Structures are given as structure tokens and as C-alpha cells.
């Protein structure tokens, strides 16, 4: 009826019967570059940061922050290019949404001591926070250099909020 009915196949562990632990699956999916896997893994990482942040703490899992930085710096480039209609394509929208999701994940993790301690010791994240804050200041003081195009305001809105939260946390370490 089936070759699985051998005695040899009576001693299989329960750990591999599914194929891969979900943490490894999410890490490898982020490592791939396939957009569908990227979106799936980012949704799962966001849920974990919201409902179980101790399983993905930036200390117990090193080399987790580099991936988020890879998703976050193109967000800096986009935000600089956000003073005009520039989200015409769907790949641009996908990159923007991936950046926003990674930023929210970072903020949710920064709500913890070890994760924010790891975040402070990173020049890239602090420089990005400063860049977003200077853009917000340019919007606030009403400078003629960089004027937000209202068709994008929504995006910017969310962005600002996350940044400020991050700042709040790291405000204790400067």
C-alpha cells in the first residue's frame, strides 16, 4: 500500500515532521528576496513583535537588525523623494510598505530594554531618525526647500509617528 510501512519509518522525530521551524522560515524568507515571501515574513514578524517580543529580542537573535536596516534605508531615499508624485509604480509602493512594516517592527522591539540597548549602538538607525526629524521640522517651519505633496501626506503621517516613538526610547540613552 505504501513504502512508509517499514519498521525503519517508525522512529521519526516530531520536530522535523513539519519541515522547518517558523523562525528559520521567516529568516530564510527575508534572506531570499522573493517579494511574496518578504511580505509573509514581515507580517509574521510584526505579529510576533506585538504579541511575543521576547522570542525575537534583538539580543538573543543577533544579525536580525541588519535585515531591517536593509529594508529601512531605501525608505530614507523614498522619503527624500516624497515631495512630488513618485509612487507611480507598484514596486515603489511595495518597497515603501516593506519599509513601514520594518520600522513598526523596530519600534515595537525598541519598547524593550535589551532591544533598545542594541538599537542605540547603531549609527544608521540614529542617522535615519535624525533625517526623518529634520524632514518633519522642514514641514513644520514651512520651509520652501522641501514641501510635502499632499497626495503622499498619509504615508508621511504614519512615518513621523513611528520615528517619534523610537526617539522617545533612545532619548534615555543620549
Amino acid at each position: 500500500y505504501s513504502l512508509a510501512n517499514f519498521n525503519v519509518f517508525q522512529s521519526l522525530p516530531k520536530e522535523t515532521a513539519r519541515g522547518v521551524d517558523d523562525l528559520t522560515r521567516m529568516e530564510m524568507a527575508l534572506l531570499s528576496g522573493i517579494p511574496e515571501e518578504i511580505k509573509w515574513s514581515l507580517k509574521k514578524y510584526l505579529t510576533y513583535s506585538n504579541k511575543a517580543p521576547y522570542m525575537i529580542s534583538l539580543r538573543t537573535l543577533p544579525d536580525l537588525l541588519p535585515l531591517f536596516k536593509t529594508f529601512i534605508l531605501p525608505l530614507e531615499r523614498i522619503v527624500e523623494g516624497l515631495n512630488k508624485s513618485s509612487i507611480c509604480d507598484s514596486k515603489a509602493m511595495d518597497s515603501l510598505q516593506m519599509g513601514l512594516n520594518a520600522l513598526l517592527i523596530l519600534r515595537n522591539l525598541a519598547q524593550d530594554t535589551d532591544s533598545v540597548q542594541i538599537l542605540v549602538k547603531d549609527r544608521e538607525i540614529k542617522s535615519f531618525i535624525l533625517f526623518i526629524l529634520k524632514k518633519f521640522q522642514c514641514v513644520a517651519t514651512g520651509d520652501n526647500k522641501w514641501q510635502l505633496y499632499e497626495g503622499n501626506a498619509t504615508f508621511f503621517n504614519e512615518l513621523t509617528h513611528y520615528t517619534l516613538d523610537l526617539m522617545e526610547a533612545i532619548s534615555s540613552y543620549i
Binding site: 522547518v20 530564510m28 524568507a29 534572506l31
Partner: protein, 179 residues
Amino acid sequence: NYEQEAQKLEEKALRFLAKQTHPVIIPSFASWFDISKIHEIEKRSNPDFFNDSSRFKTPKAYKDTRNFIINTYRLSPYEYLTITAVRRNVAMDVASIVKIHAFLEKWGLINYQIDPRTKPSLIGPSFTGHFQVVLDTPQGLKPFLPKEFPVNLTIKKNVYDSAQDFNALQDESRNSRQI
């Protein structure tokens, strides 16, 4: 004339074609992989074969080794394909063999351990059509000709009703009135 040539060519190509018996399962994140091409993920994870540093490490050698390992695994996907067997068959330095084996094993391309009798089967968006995987013609089987001569033969065909039939590798021929 050419009709008999193409007929004998199809006969020979079908005689020396690897008939698949067991299904191969790989995790979804390993979907960028092609047996005949090299991806950026492979060049980043193995910079020594492509940075032109050594002469013993060439992209051709890497590709031949990894294709040997892939074919050996795919031909019998129930066993484990230990490193020692590969090392006895391949002629590289042991460090490179180990690195390639570990890289292929991390991405589930080989030695991906599941128990596929505990998961459902779905249908992707791409479905319900004729799929023709076009592979190059083998040499040493081309005819001996002592005008053009194009060839677009078809070697073997398989039909499936559902995706579960595709996964289980069950064709309509035997499935129709099995018991």
C-alpha cells in the same frame, strides 16, 4: 528521410531519459533556484569561486560540483546523501565540498526532511494548462549526416486531474480503476 531521423532521435532520447519516480519537495523560499543558472544568492554566499582569486576555484567547477550533488540527491530523495560519498566522487578540496554541501542543505535544496503525509495540497494561480519544459538536445545522440534541420520533438507526456495527483505523481493511466 528526416522523418526516420527524428524518430530514431526520439527513441534514443527516451531510452536515456531519467524517469522520475519519487516526488521532490523543497521549501518555498528556495524558489529562485534553477539547475542551469547561478543566482546572486549563490555568488554572495560563495564569493571565492567568482572573485577570480584562485585557479582551482572557477565558476565552472562550482557549477559542476553543485549540479552533481543536486542530481545525486534528486535521483534518490529518500536517502540522506552524506558528505563522504560526494567527496569520494568529486575532486575538489574538502573545504569547498563542505561549504557547497552546507549551503545547499541550508536552503533545503538537499536533505530537506519532512513527512509529507501530514499536510494538505493547494492550487497555485498558475495552473490548468499545457506545460512544456524545453531542455537542450543531448549530444552523442544527434544523427550522423555525412539545408536546415530544426527539431522540436516531444519525448514523454503526463496528465493530471488535480494538484494532489501532480504531487503524488499519479497519472490518469493507472489511477483510472486502480482497485
